[model samples]
Target: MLVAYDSMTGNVKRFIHKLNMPAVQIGEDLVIDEDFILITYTTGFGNVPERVLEFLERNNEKLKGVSASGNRNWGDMFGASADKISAKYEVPIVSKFELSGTNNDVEYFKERVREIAT
Candidate 1:
């Protein structure tokens, strides 16, 4: 499945690289008419970034799931964007990672992607 993402502090970007899968950044040119997973970071107070919200406004129907990167210090707010997106789109929030993520986070996310992609 295609992996489409948006990163703020490079954490999500780095995490996506570790996924070892075909992926692209979310932007005006992004077009995913087929099944795809979204990877993003939570912004202030766990809100989804504006760019991601804009992208989803047009392509939400194709979203299969989401993975979110956030600072653990945020506690309950950590990965809040994942929860918001999942609720709004009725898609699964597949994984939540702290910052760039640990090796275990990458492994678990990859496994989740595999399960959904199949």
Candidate 2:
């Protein structure tokens, strides 16, 4: 699926690269502005990145779903950024991952997208 994302620690950015899919970072202009899942990192305890907030304001209309990066160590707060966006946008919380994600994380995330896309 098409993905739009932002990363403070670059983990989100690196995870998207491993997905081997078309993607655009969340900032300034979009080269691929269309329906896509938002993949972003959580900051502080469970806050969505500022850039993500701005992008959502500009493109929430196009956001089809969400996936987020945060270590599960935060327990209920893990992927909280995704939860917040998903709730506000009324979109699906496609998946959640730790740090940059692992091999299984990549596979699992793609599978969910497949379930929706095809």
Candidate 3:
């Protein structure tokens, strides 16, 4: 399993580690051999990260085999660009959770993951 994220603040990365899942930061060699991949990010001005755009263009084939999530910061246009990107790649977009507060709730986020996984 892989957790891929581009965080505006460190909170997203911090929360993923809190789940006790082994994670590798994006822009590194992914050492895992599995199809279970999650894409978590803080949207900027309603847009997906540039890195995400690059990834989608380059790795869409590999990404199609994975489950995904978009944790958009509320008040941003949630999932607008993400929706388009997912469709373009034919990747299964499994879930989307808006961070309702400035701070993240780790437990609630984990439940979001479970809700999609099940």
Candidate 4:
């Protein structure tokens, strides 16, 4: 199972829905036992999404790891948060696809994910 949280200029939400993936808005309640959680949040003034922040607060205890893909500004936010959370939870974190925008190389990102899964 996969739990995804996206807060792009609505792009991430649209993408998640299009994939037919069941996702809860970052702050919403989720009741699945997922092996992986993918966080795809937009950068807001170079900060994490408010919804993502809520999820972190609520699920901080279960976050064994975090992996991210998005703009540099957003990546920076995730980096800081992942560091703090990983330290506190003793979880490992890995990040990928430091995107500047939606036009970034999609195939490259896909390959990266495949690599990680393998």
Candidate 5:
């Protein structure tokens, strides 16, 4: 599946980089006509970034799942973007991570992706 993401502070970008999978940035106007997953960072007070909202507005039908990153200090709001997106789109929230995530998070996400493929 295609992995598409939006990042700020490079945390989500760094996480995706280590995945060693083919991926694309959300704001790049790339045509994503196939099934894919989304990775994004939470914004102020658990809001999805405006760019991500826009991307989803057009591409939600192609969305297969979501993963999000946030600061742990946000407490219940950590990775809240994934919750909002999944609720609104009826897609699974595949994983939630703090900042760039640990190696274990990557492994978990990889397994989820593999499961989806099957």
Candidate 6:
């Protein structure tokens, strides 16, 4: 599946880089026609980033799954955006990682995505 993401403070971008997969950053005019897994960072007490919401406005129909990046210091709010998106769109969450995530996290994330692909 295609990997699409919105990154602020570079955490999600940094992590996606290590995935060694093709990833398209969410940008104006970006159109993803293939099934994709979305990765986004949360904002303001676990709220989904408005940019991400806007992306879903056009792209949610093709979304297959999701994941969120966080600092893990937000207590109950860490990775909260993932659940919100999943609930609204009925997509599964493949993983939730703190900051850039570890190398193991990267590997496991790929595993989870592949698991659901079959």
Q: What is the lDDT ranking, best to worst?
A: 1, 5, 6, 2, 3, 4
For 60-100, candidate 6 gives per-residue lDDT tens digits of 88999999998789989889999899999999999999999
Residues 1-118, candidate 3, lDDT per residue (tens digit)?
3555545566556656665655656653433344344455635555667766665555455443222234544434565555665666665554454433223454554555555455
Clashing pairs in 2: none
- Local accuracy by lDDT, each model: 0.92, 0.88, 0.51, 0.50, 0.92, 0.91
Top-down TM-score ranking: 6, 1, 5, 2, 3, 4
- lDDT of candidate 1? 0.92
- Per-model RMSD to reference: 0.9, 1.4, 4.5, 4.5, 1.0, 0.8
* Predicted structure 1, TM vs. truth: 0.96
lDDT of 2 by residue, 1-118 (tens): 7888898878998999999988888776644467788899998889898888877888888788899999889999999999999999999999999999999999988999888776
Each prediction's TM-score versus the true structure:
0.96, 0.93, 0.59, 0.51, 0.95, 0.96
lDDT of 4 by residue, 1-118 (tens): 3545555566555544543434565646753344445555445444455666666766666454554445555534644544544565575654433533243333443344455455
Model 1 poorest ten-residue lDDT run:
28-37
**Model 2 lDDT at residue 92:** 92
Runs with alpha carbons beyond 4 Å of true place in candidate 5: none
Write one digit per residue (lDDT tens) for candidate 1, span 1-118.
Answer: 8899999779999998998989999996677888999999999898999999999999998999999999889999999999999998999999999989999999999899899887
Backbone clash total, candidate 3: 0
Residue pairs with backbone overlap in model 4? none
Clashing pairs in 1: none
Best by TM-score: 6
Q: Encode model 5's per-residue lDDT on 1-118: one tens digit a residue.
A: 7899999789999999999988999884766898999999999998999999999988898899999988889999999999999999998999999999999999999899878766
